[PDB]
Amino acid sequence: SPESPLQAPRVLIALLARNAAHALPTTLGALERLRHPRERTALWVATDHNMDNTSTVLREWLVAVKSLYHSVEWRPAEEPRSYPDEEGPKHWSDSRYEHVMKLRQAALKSARDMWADYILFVDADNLILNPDTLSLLIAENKTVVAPMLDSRAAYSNFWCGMTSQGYYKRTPAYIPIRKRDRRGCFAVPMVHSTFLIDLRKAASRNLAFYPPHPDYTWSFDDIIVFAFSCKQAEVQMYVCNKEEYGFLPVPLRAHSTLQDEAESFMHVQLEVMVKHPPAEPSRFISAPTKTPDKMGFDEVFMINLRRRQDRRERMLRALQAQEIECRLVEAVDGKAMNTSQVEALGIQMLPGYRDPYHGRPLTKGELGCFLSHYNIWKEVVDRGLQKSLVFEDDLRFEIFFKRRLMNLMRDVEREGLDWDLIYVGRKRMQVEHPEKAVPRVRNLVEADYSYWTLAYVISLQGARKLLAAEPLSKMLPVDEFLPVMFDKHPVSEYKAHFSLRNLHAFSVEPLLIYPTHYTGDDGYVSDTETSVVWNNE
Amino acid sequence: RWSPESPLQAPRVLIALLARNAAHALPTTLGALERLRHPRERTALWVATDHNMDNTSTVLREWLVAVKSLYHSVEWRPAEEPRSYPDEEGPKHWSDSRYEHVMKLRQAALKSARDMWADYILFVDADNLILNPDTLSLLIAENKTVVAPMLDSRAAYSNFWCGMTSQGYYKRTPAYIPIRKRDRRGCFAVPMVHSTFLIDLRKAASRNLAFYPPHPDYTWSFDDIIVFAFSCKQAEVQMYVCNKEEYGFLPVPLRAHSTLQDEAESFMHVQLEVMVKHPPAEPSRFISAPTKTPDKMGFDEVFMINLRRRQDRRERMLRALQAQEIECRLVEAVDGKAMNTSQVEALGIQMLPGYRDPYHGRPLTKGELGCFLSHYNIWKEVVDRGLQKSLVFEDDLRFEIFFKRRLMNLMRDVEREGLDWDLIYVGRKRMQVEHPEKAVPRVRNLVEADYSYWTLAYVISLQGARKLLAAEPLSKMLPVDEFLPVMFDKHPVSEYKAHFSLRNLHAFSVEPLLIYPTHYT
Ligand SMILES: O=c1ccn([C@@H]2O[C@H](COP(=O)(O)OP(=O)(O)O[C@H]3O[C@H](CO)[C@H](O)[C@H](O)[C@H]3O)[C@@H](O)[C@H]2O)c(=O)[nH]1
Ligand SMILES: O=c1ccn([C@@H]2O[C@H](COP(=O)(O)OP(=O)(O)O[C@H]3O[C@H](CO)[C@H](O)[C@H](O)[C@H]3O)[C@@H](O)[C@H]2O)c(=O)[nH]1
Ligand SMILES: O=c1ccn([C@@H]2O[C@H](COP(=O)(O)OP(=O)(O)O)[C@@H](O)[C@H]2O)c(=O)[nH]1
Ligand SMILES: [Ca+2]
Ligand SMILES: [Ca+2]
Ligand SMILES: [Cl-]
Ligand SMILES: [Cl-]
Ligand SMILES: [Cl-]
Ligand SMILES: [Cl-]
Ligand SMILES: [Cl-]
Ligand SMILES: [Cl-]
Ligand SMILES: [Mn+2]
Ligand code: NA
């Protein structure tokens, strides 16, 4: 006579949301798809001080999901829409700290009063991609445990050290934990943003988000107060990094903007789509339509091989997320060309070239890569495009890419700089000393020896200069042909074949675009280096 | 870095209490629930009362007012009118409308427990006395989905069946008596448990249990405990009963045409059964039971023989008599062991020549002497005061249910019929059981007394007291439980009766017996 399985533990998900409408469709979409039984899950949502339609998005989602969960608590407040003592929407004044602390205490009291086993705090911009995160956190059997969320930088939802006054302290252990070099659940003095409290443990009764502990003497900060509360309760905060759990945006400054926040979370979605499928939104919420543009450029090109469908879709998704429209140029497959078609185009390798690394001659793929860029150069001159931006099909976008690239071009044109080529993504080779800065143009340098063609801006003058050199009779890899044309290539023999090397080439500083996969990374694809010489099979 | 985790809090249990016409039992029943050794912050109360002819809701609300702050939550669902079901024949009749309402109530408590995320729901009938404060913990420890504690009763009845007739009817199996008697201890799979039981709402199969409506496949009678039992079978939830130790007591259900007073006295007998081997079940700190006032049951006097060194027997008997509203005159027993031979000779006491123990052939003991002298002094007092009818008690006896009413009705019938009587056994050891004792015509529940072997309790008339004294039994001392059978000429040893010339005692016995011994040696 067997006893049935136990039901899953009872969890209350507590969600405080202020100015989160940009993130809720994806964040709430992740939460609703958690692999934890919904009848064993309850929802506690509090929103207030919203300058956007956060209240409406939450209400639309709650009405659609209410009948699926154990219970829903909904605490909206439409007015006021900003704190009276705030300096901005991203400023954390004492009134904001006190209110947030009281909300988490209210959510904790709710979880206790409803006899829940756990309360799960998730910040409205924290994306829990792993549906097993809640189950995994429960399995660790801790009183307070947080999953380590990834960010674009070293930031994460934990500290490895804390001073005697509650300030952050960096320890050597932080980096290996952050990079998942050491995997496990580590005792840390601080966790926040997303963490799990075990309300079955007797010691959890002594935890409080508000008021501060009677012996508290530190700053009126919400996460420090709770950390000190676990200290007095003798409750050890833990962070677990045993696998990927989710992603979170790096917090902004007090004087930042709501657009900075919205674009920052968009970068989280971009970072997810680097090595994961896109994080889908909730099927009960619709994100607002986006209007793509060309960022003021005359044209935006995207070189993509017709067979690389995965790259095309990832790039088209990334560009649509950033409201950027491109012209999809079908790349020239160098492997598909036979020797006769190469001769039909009159293509001859530069006499004596060898790969700077393994010494192999020009490959068929490198030939096609050069031809695709060359064809875009012709189209720039044919259409008379003053400024055009060229993309490859495997690049990772930096945060605030669109605004930062538009601001750079605006500064370039305002100073009347005579430019031919502007690197957006490259491999800088002169690293012993900084490259020469461009006067009166911030974030721009004179390009020294470089070695990539991920992304760049090209002028009509610069397009003519490349075609004028007629590189087809002396073809090099395009990422080496350019440093020849602005006279930075180390091999003097290569530059000797090119009589005029007057190209004006610059680079963004810091770079705005990096490769998605590097050599040796899982999934790295280099159709240029397919070990196939251009001359013949 | 090892860091210990604090203990887990106790499981969260909702105690569901349905109360109708239960004011007589609540002060003791609710007091037992208070003192359950389980954290009250992990306990919730669900109480529903309705169709009350007594002050049940008043008693309940005063108790809840006094304990509300100690519990996780309290739900209160009273309904003053109507005070009786429109289809009921009486307050103890289980009509279909009463069955339906009680099923819906238990379903409401079950839904309430699920909605508050309790671990367990414990049902306790308002008349069930959970004397063992660890009962809740022990039931949780068995890790069953539906488990009930075997509560004790005055009879074979308990809160469980061992067999079922595939049509919902009760069925007797050979395993019932061993479980009921605690000859076999443990937790046993059974087709039916009721009254007080514990449901484990952590188990996945508990989601399919339902008190109402009946399961779609239900084809049996509209009975509440059958419907829930069938719900467990369809959910593949095995019902269990545990008897590993004593947990509590419950009255035996009455008949449809019984009265509220019948129920009140029935639960009072439950308290008597508790006091046999336990201290009296204490009431609530906040509820007081109504004061009782004892009488002499219409007798001219009620005696109770007790030796002063037997303080426990004295206190237990007085508690038993007070509960039954019976007042008595305490008579200090003669301690025959303390009597020296000089005091024995001063009273002219001589054993009946040739007496031998019917089981060990031993002479008359000093203890039997003192016991005889105790009854002898009462007979003497009966004749001095002229008491027409007196009731005589010893100090180690267990009372039957409805004792007071059952004895007073017999005496009324005896007087109505003008029966000439000297001795009426209220408790004895019937030795002639091969053929039935001759019934007394026109007097119900009374028979002619044949050979008997005890003197636990008897009614004696002034005429009867005169006859016993006239025999001069001190010169022919014989155990009192044998001297009486000699006097109504039913003693087997004709040589013993030869020493007594006149043996004209009119003896009768109540049938069935209203008083039995406690240890029943
Ligand atoms: O008035 C408010 C203020 C904030 N929030 C909510 O509180 C969470 C945190 O707000 P932010 O997303 O702006 O937080 P940051 O990215 O700036 O980093 C945060 O990291 C910790 C998270 O616990 C602390 O809350 C810290 O104060 C805070 O800066 C969010 O779910 C937000 O929606 C509200 O609901 N109402
Ligand atoms: O209208 C009503 C009728 C009954 N009850 C309650 O339900 C329980 C039934 O106990 P009773 O003493 O009144 O009835 P029984 O002694 O006959 O014992 C009962 O034991 C089972 C308990 O599961 C079933 O209720 C069954 O119908 C019945 O025999 C009690 O707690 C009673 O207070 C109510 O609350 N409201
Ligand atoms: O024969 C080829 C191979 C690639 N490409 C394109 O040129 C760029 C080179 O990217 P890839 O990652 O394949 O080469 P690598 O970055 O390794 O030099 C991409 O836009 C490709 O679509 C091309 O035009 N012809
Ligand atoms: Ca945030
Ligand atoms: Ca009952
Ligand atoms: Cl709602
Ligand atoms: Cl990093
Ligand atoms: Cl920090
Ligand atoms: Cl009848
Ligand atoms: Cl009738
Ligand atoms: Cl009848
Ligand atoms: Mn590449
Ligand atoms: Na009748």
Backbone angles phi, psi at B243, to 5 degrees: -125, 25
Query: Which letter, b or e, does each residue of A164-181 get, where b requires 16 or more Cβ atoms within 10 Å of its Cβ?
Result: eebeeeeeeebeebbeee
Q: How far is CA B373 from CA B280, B329, B368, in A?
A: 32, 17, 9
For residue A167, which ligand has an atom nearest its CA?
8
Q: How far, in Å, CA of A390 to CA of A331, rounded?
A: 12
Q: How far, in Å, CA of B184 to CA of B412, rounded?
A: 45
Q: How far, in Å, CA of A105 to CA of A211, rounded?
A: 9
A368 C-beta closer than 6 A to ligand 3: yes
Tokens representing residue A147 in the block = 């999953």
Is the CB of residue A279 less than 8 Å from the CB of residue A29? yes
Tokens representing residue B188 in the block = 């046993």
A186 touches chain B (CB under 8 A): yes
Helix (H) or strand (E) holding B427: strand B423-427
> Which residues make beta-bridge pairs with A445?
A437, A507
Q: How far, in Å, CA of B450 to CA of A160, rounded?
A: 94
Q: How far, in Å, CA of B425 to CA of B507, rounded?
A: 8
DSSP for A358-410 reads T----BHHHHHHHHHHHHHHHHHHHHT-SEEEEE-SSEEEPTTHHHHHHHHHH
Quick one: A343 exposed, middle or buried, by C-beta within 10 A (0-12, 13-18, 19+)? exposed
Interface mutation target, options A72, A200, A237, A238, chain B, most CBs of B under 10 Å = A200
Strand A505-508 with A444-446, pairing: antiparallel
Yes or no, beta carbons of B1 and A187 under 8 Å apart: yes
Tokens representing residue B229 in the block = 């039992």
Among B125, B197, B267, which residue has the most ligand 2 atoms within 8 Å of its CB, making it the best to mutate?
B125
Closest CA to B46 of B101, B100, B126: B126
Cα A214 off chain centre by: 41
Q: Is B241 helix (H, G, I), strand (E, B) or coil?
A: strand
Q: How far, in Å, CA of B293 to CA of B270, rounded?
A: 19
A143 touches chain B (CB under 8 A): yes
Question: Which single residue is written with the structure tokens 């107060």?
Answer: A225
Protein residue with its CA nearest to atom 4 in ligand 2:
B20
| Ligand 1, pocket residues at CB < 6 Å | A 16-18, 20, 48-49, 92, 96, 99-100, 123-125, 192-193, 222-223, 251
Nearest chain B residue to A116 by CA: give it.
B117
DSSP annotation of B68 reads G
Q: Is A424 helix (H, G, I), strand (E, B) or coil?
A: strand
Yes or no, beta carbons of A141 and B5 under 8 Å apart: yes
Tokens representing residue A224 in the block = 């420090």
Helix (H) or strand (E) holding B30: helix B26-34
> Which residues make beta-bridge pairs with B393?
B304, B457
Helix (H) or strand (E) holding B410: helix B403-417
Cα dihedral A134/A139/A145/A150 (nearest 10): -50
Enumerate residues 6+ apart whose C-beta is below 8 A from A273.
Answer: A279, A314, A317, A318
Nearest chain B residue to A144 by CA: give it.
B5
Q: Which chain B residues are closer than 8 Å to A201 by Cβ? A: 5-9
Resolution for this experimental structure (Å): 2.7
Q: CATH 3.90.550.10 in chain B, residues?
A: 13-265
Backbone angles phi, psi at B144, to 5 degrees: -100, 165
Q: Which chain A residues are closer than 8 Å to B5 by Cβ? A: 141-143, 201, 203
Q: How far, in Å, CA of A52 to CA of A69, rounded?
A: 27
Tokens representing residue B315 in the block = 């206190």
Helix (H) or strand (E) holding B75: strand B73-79
Quick one: B416 exposed, middle or buried, by C-beta within 10 A (0-12, 13-18, 19+)? exposed
Yes or no, beta carbons of A202 and B8 under 8 Å apart: yes
Tokens representing residue B337 in the block = 């062991």
Quick one: B422 exposed, middle or buried, by C-beta within 10 A (0-12, 13-18, 19+)? buried
Q: How far, in Å, CA of A495 to CA of A465, rounded?
A: 15
- Please check whether the domain covering A289-515 is classified as CATH 3.90.550: yes
CATH architecture of A11-263: Alpha-Beta Complex (3.90)
Nearest chain A residue to B207 by CA: give it.
A7
DSSP annotation of A67 reads G
DSSP for B253-322 reads P--TT--HHHHHHHHHHHHHHHHHHSPPPP--SS--PPPP--B-TT-SEEEEEE-TT-HHHHHHHHHHHH
Q: How far, in Å, CA of A460 to CA of B328, rounded?
A: 125
User: How many CA atoms within 13 Å lie on the side-chain side of A276?
Assistant: 14
Question: Which single residue is written with the structure tokens 């049940």?
Answer: B56
**Position in ligand 1 atom list of the atom nearest CA A222:** 27
User: CA angle A100-A104-A106, nearest 5°?
Assistant: 110
Tell me, in angstroms, the distance from the centre of ligand 2 to residue A85's CA: 63
Protein residue with its CA nearest to atom 30 in ligand 2:
B125
Q: Using omega within 30 degrees of 0 as the cis cutoff, is the peptide bond preceding A356 cis?
A: no
Yes or no, beta carbons of B118 and A114 under 8 Å apart: no
Protein residue with its CA nearest to atom 6 in ligand 3:
A369
Q: How many helices (H) and strands (E) does chain B have?
A: 14, 21
DSSP annotation of A120 reads E
Tokens representing residue B65 in the block = 């007012």
Backbone angles phi, psi at A483, to 5 degrees: -60, -25
Yes or no, beta carbons of B3 and A187 under 8 Å apart: yes
User: CA angle B107-B108-B109, nearest 5°?
Assistant: 90
Alpha carbon of A394: minimum distance to chain B alpha carbons (Å) = 43
Other Cβ atoms less than 10 A from the Cβ of A369: the count is: 23
Is the CB of residue B305 less than 8 Å from the CB of residue B392? yes
Protein residue with its CA nearest to atom 20 in ligand 3:
A392
Alpha carbon of A35: minimum distance to chain B alpha carbons (Å) = 17
Is the CB of residue A361 less than 8 Å from the CB of residue A335? no
DSSP for B187-218 reads EEEESEE-SSEEEETTBGGGGG--SSSPPTT-
Yes or no, beta carbons of B204 and A4 under 8 Å apart: yes
Tokens representing residue B232 in the block = 């467990």
> Which residues make beta-bridge pairs with A72?
A43
Residue in B5, B118, B205 nearest the CB of A143? B5
DSSP for A192-246 reads -SEEEEETTBGGGGG--SSSPPTT--S-S-HHHHHHHHHHHTT--EEEE-SS---
Q: Which chain B residues are closer than 8 Å to A235 by Cβ? A: 6
Q: Choose the CATH number for B292-517 among 1.10.3470, 3.90.550, 3.20.20, 3.40.50.
A: 3.90.550
What sign results for the dihedral spanned by CA atoms A23, A25, A30, A36? positive
Which residue intervals of B41-95 are DSSP H helices?
56-67
Q: How far, in Å, CA of B289 to CA of B26, rounded?
A: 9
User: How many CA atoms within 13 Å lie on the side-chain side of B81?
Assistant: 0
- Work out the end-to-end distance of chain B between its first and last CA atoms, rounded to an integer number of angstroms: 65
Is the CB of residue A120 less than 8 Å from the CB of residue A107? no
DSSP annotation of B8 reads B
Question: Which single residue is written with the structure tokens 């350019």?
Answer: A482
Is the CB of residue A533 less than 8 Å from the CB of residue A364? yes
Q: How far, in Å, CA of A320 to CA of A298, rounded?
A: 18
Write out the residues surrounding ion ligand 9, Cβ under 5 A: B 257
| Superfamily, domain B13-265 | Spore Coat Polysaccharide Biosynthesis Protein SpsA; Chain A (3.90.550.10)
Helix (H) or strand (E) holding A456: strand A455-459
Q: How far, in Å, CA of A41 to CA of B344, rounded?
A: 86
Yes or no, beta carbons of A236 and B3 under 8 Å apart: yes
Q: How far, in Å, CA of A469 to CA of A485, rounded?
A: 8
Method: X-ray
Q: How far, in Å, CA of A107 to CA of A153, rounded?
A: 30
Q: How far, in Å, CA of A217 to CA of B34, rounded?
A: 43
Alpha carbon of A57: minimum distance to chain B alpha carbons (Å) = 27
Q: How far, in Å, CA of B160 to CA of B229, rounded?
A: 11
Q: Residue type at B93?
A: H
Is the CB of residue A364 less than 8 Å from the CB of residue A531? no
Protein residue with its CA nearest to atom 24 in ligand 1:
A223
Tokens representing residue B107 in the block = 């379903």
Tokens representing residue A117 in the block = 């086993």
Closest CA to A369 of A347, A343, A396: A347
Q: How far, in Å, CA of A307 to CA of A332, rounded?
A: 11
Q: How far is CA A416 from CA A412, A440, A485, in A?
A: 6, 10, 22
Tokens representing residue A246 in the block = 């989710």
- Work out the end-to-end distance of chain A between its first and last CA atoms, rounded to an integer number of angstroms: 72
Quick one: B216 exposed, middle or buried, by C-beta within 10 A (0-12, 13-18, 19+)? exposed
Q: Which chain A residues are closer than 8 Å to B198 by Cβ? A: none
A203 touches chain B (CB under 8 A): yes
For residue B123, which ligand has an atom nearest its CA?
2
Tokens representing residue B16 in the block = 């569901």
A188 touches chain B (CB under 8 A): no
User: How many CA atoms within 13 Å lie on the side-chain side of B42?
Assistant: 20
DSSP annotation of A250 reads P
Residue in B9, B118, B207 nearest the CB of A200? B9
Residue in A115, A141, A187 nearest the CB of B118? A115
Strand A455-459 with A387-391, pairing: antiparallel
A177 touches chain B (CB under 8 A): no
Enumerate residues 6+ apart whose C-beta is below 8 A from A65.
Answer: A32, A43, A72, A284
Is the CB of residue B402 less than 8 Å from the CB of residue B265? yes
Residue in A7, A203, A204 nearest the CB of B202? A7
